[PDB]
Amino acid sequence: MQIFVKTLTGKTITLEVEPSDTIENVKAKIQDKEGIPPDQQRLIFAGKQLEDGRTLSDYNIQKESTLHLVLRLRGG
């Protein structure tokens, strides 16, 4: 399935994934494309901060969903 990731600079990252992929699978795929390490990524679906070992299915994430990408800071 195709999902859509929106970054703070407004970049649209388009990812083929499958619903049983993890949010750490997501973080690795985006690094492959944009050079961002998973450690600095925080990922938000519908106001909710997403946790790494959980699956896209478990969050109710399916095709054509908008997900949002945040950079974690130094102090936080």
CB 4 within 8 A of CB 39: no
3-state SS class at 32: helix
Among residues 31, 28, 65, 30, the alpha carbon closest in space to that of 48 is found at: 65
Distances (CA, A) of 10 to 5, 18, 67: 9, 24, 12
Domain enclosing residue 25, as ranges: 1-76
Among residues 61, 58, 57, 3, the alpha carbon closest in space to that of 29 is found at: 3
Distances (CA, A) of 32 to 29, 48, 59, 60, 75: 5, 24, 23, 24, 26
Total domains in the chain come to 1
3-state SS class at 10: coil
Among residues 11, 45, 46, the alpha carbon closest in space to that of 26 is found at: 45
Specify the CATH number for the domain of residue 47: 3.10.20.90
Helix (H) or strand (E) holding 9: none
